């Protein structure tokens, strides 16, 4: 459950990300594939080498989705409705993996936002990514 | 895997009463029903849209037999699971692209199935022994992932 | 999300459990302590030997909580309010342990309900136990 | 844990720049803030109800130093983490009653602290090497639980 403080924190952190959101998306993905190789099982059709355009492209889509989630933080389940359908009925990614990507996004943000990544913001961002994950897996069964 | 000799003996004593054909189909079918996302690997099997379709699907039954036959072979080498499942680990990673989390889910569904099948004979200590076995098999199957 | 079918399945299975709720709760705990020994870290004040009075008493309390939850399936956050509070602010059991207990409760039920533990009912109970675990950890942060 | 030679070099090189005292207090503090249920082991430390309280607590700082100092010692014995941490595993299980999931959580928080501190130097390959190390230490600390 996000508190107003959490929403405030996420909107400030995501705002500083700004136009680099897509870049960070791609880096989080690269960090995930290297740190947790079992996640590559969902991308057999991708070139996963460093600097891959598919990774850069997919990173952009993930980032744009998160930006939309932040804009619609008070009604995420409707805002992400299409994505939750796609993940539940088509992609069918095991829920454990969402934690892995979330961790890698936090690591990425920490590496890019020294001043803004305080313990309070870290906590709000972790809750936020967990809520997004929960929404993306809410229609699995 | 480190099972005690009394744990090993309990595991083998119970397994001798298992019809791997029946149990295999039930275990794989329940996995597909309880955790629907695992169906992603079996679109080639046909209709899996309802519990009745899954449980009655002949390909699900045949595949269950194969899986649990390989599991059964593994019980003869509890001291070297890594070795026994090495080729299968490579196959599941490089060719089939199966997330190893699925092996853990199947392990727990199998434990439920053994409990359903044997009732009171599936005691707490026997369960504990099978939990070690199923974790060990999942770890062995995940060892060659990269 | 629990569907009407899920609710019917759970109600039918738990009714069959009836007066044995407490016995099954104790069995589930013993199963958990033996199969997943890290769970014992939360009970250092208990005698955990087979048939201990503390395990028996605790199993009955756990079972009664689940009976209450089944009866209030459409109103669980309110019905389990005291328990959510207790777990979040006093006991503080790491969320991962709820899935270990839920698995051991399923195994216990399987072992006792041969006719009733069909694949559909197995799915509904697993969903029910996940929902209960979610409510109990909902106030953690 | 098996690290490739370049991984070993990366781990060692970065760690040579870490101030254990500082990093330790930050990682433990962040654990207590981000996952507040971990506060259950530290009631005697005082009021831990706000982030500022936690981060400025001298007992959190001190314990952070202790924890990370032991961790540091382990980096010199990557080839035998289990033996190195055996006595500490037994202590955490039998005396302190610490659920080993806590070791996994601290590992991930530690990764975030290193990234925060080192920025761009904490590259994807460097993170991967550290993820292997923190998982190995966590498994080592969990090994003697019974
Ligand atoms: C914050 C969590 C995540 C978000 C917001 C997210 C969002 C998205 C978006 C926006 C797409 C593109 C959909 C489209 O093109 O219409 C997508 C696709 C996909 N996602 Fe998720 N995703 C998340 C986590 C994950 C995880 C954890 C995995 C598994 C490791 C995963 C696997 C996939 C795959 C395989 C695709 C299809 C890629 C393709 O073929 O182009 N995603 N996701
Ligand atoms: C106890 C764990 C498991 C064992 C021992 C096992 C064993 C096997 C074996 C022996 C084969 C046939 C290999 C060949 O000769 O081609 C196979 C194939 C396969 N397995 Fe696994 N399996 C296990 C779990 C799983 C699970 C959990 C999944 C997915 C949810 C899975 C997915 C597959 C698929 C998709 C195939 C190929 C099916 C086909 O031929 O169309 N396996 N497995
Ligand atoms: C199905 C999920 C669970 C439910 C419904 C549940 C319910 C309960 C109930 C009803 C109580 C007694 C409260 C009272 O004193 O009136 C309790 C206490 C307790 N629970 Fe939970 N519990 C659950 C899971 C867990 C988990 C997984 C653990 C950790 C492994 C745990 C650890 C404890 C502990 C340590 C106590 C205090 C026992 C004592 O000192 O007497 N519980 N729980
Ligand atoms: C990298 C993982 C960890 C290592 C290497 C580590 C190491 C240590 C060491 C060296 C001590 C002092 C033991 C002694 O007095 O001889 C200690 C104590 C302790 N640790 Fe761990 N620790 C780790 C993680 C954790 C975590 C994650 C928690 C809980 C969140 C925890 C809880 C405690 C507690 C409560 C004590 C006793 C504190 C006191 O008496 O002042 N530890 N640990």
């Amino acid at each position: 459950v996000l508190s107003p403080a959490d929403k405030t924190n996420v909107k400030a952190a995501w705002g500083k990300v700004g136009a680099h959101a897509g870049e960070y998306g791609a880096e989080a993905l690269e960090r995930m594939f290297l740190s947790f190789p079992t996640t590559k099982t969902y991308f057999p059709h991708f070139d996963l080498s460093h600097g891959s355009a598919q990774v850069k492209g997919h990173g952009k889509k993930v980032a744009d989705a998160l930006t939309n989630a932040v804009a619609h933080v008070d009604d995420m389940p409707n805002a992400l409705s299409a994505l939750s359908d796609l993940h539940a009925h088509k992609l069918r990614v095991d829920p454990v993996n969402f934690k892995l990507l979330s961790h890698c996004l936090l690591v990425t943000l920490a590496a890019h936002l020294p001043a803004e990544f305080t313990p309070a913001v870290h906590a709000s961002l972790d809750k936020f990514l967990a809520s997004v994950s929960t929404v993306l897996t809410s229609k699995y069964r | 895997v480190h099972l005690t000799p009394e744990e090993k003996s309990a595991v083998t004593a119970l397994w001798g009463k298992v019809n791997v054909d029946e149990v295999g189909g039930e275990a794989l079918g329940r996995l597909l029903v309880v955790y629907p996302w695992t169906q992603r690997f079996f679109e080639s099997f046909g209709d899996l849209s309802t519990p009745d379709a899954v449980m009655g699907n002949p390909k699900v039954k045949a595949h269950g037999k194969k899986v649990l036959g390989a599991f059964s072979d593994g019980l003869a080498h509890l001291d070297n699971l890594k070795g026994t499942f090495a080729t299968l680990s490579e196959l599941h990673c490089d060719k089939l692209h199966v997330d190893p989390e699925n092996f853990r889910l199947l392990g727990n569904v199998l434990v439920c199935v053994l409990a359903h099948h044997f009732g009171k004979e599936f005691t707490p200590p026997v369960q504990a022994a099978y939990q070690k076995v199923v974790a060990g098999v999942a770890n062995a199957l995940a060892h060659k992932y990269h």
Side-chain angles (χ1 to χ4, degrees), chain A residues 40 42 91-92 94 97 141, chain B residues 34 37 40 43 99 146:
Chain A
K40 295 186 293 181
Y42 298 92
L91 307 175
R92 285 167 293 189
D94 190 283
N97 296 290
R141 61 178 184 169
Chain B
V34 174
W37 55 96
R40 72 192 308 276
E43 313 207 284
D99 178 357
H146 65 82

Side-chain angles (χ1 to χ4, degrees), chain A residues 7 11 15 26 36 40 42-44 49 54 60 63 74 79 84 94 104 110 115 117 127 130 134 140:
Chain A
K7 302 175 199 174
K11 287 174 163 296
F36 311 105
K40 295 186 293 181
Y42 298 92
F43 301 82
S49 60
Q54 276 171 303
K60 198 172 314 213
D74 293 302
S84 64
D94 190 283
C104 289
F117 200 75
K127 289 180 57 177
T134 294
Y140 271 45

Side-chain angles (χ1 to χ4, degrees), chain A residues 36-57:
Chain A
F36 311 105
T38 60
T39 57
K40 295 186 293 181
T41 59
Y42 298 92
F43 301 82
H45 50 316
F46 273 30
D47 157 48
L48 298 174
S49 60
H50 181 40
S52 168
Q54 276 171 303
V55 172
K56 279 182 302 171

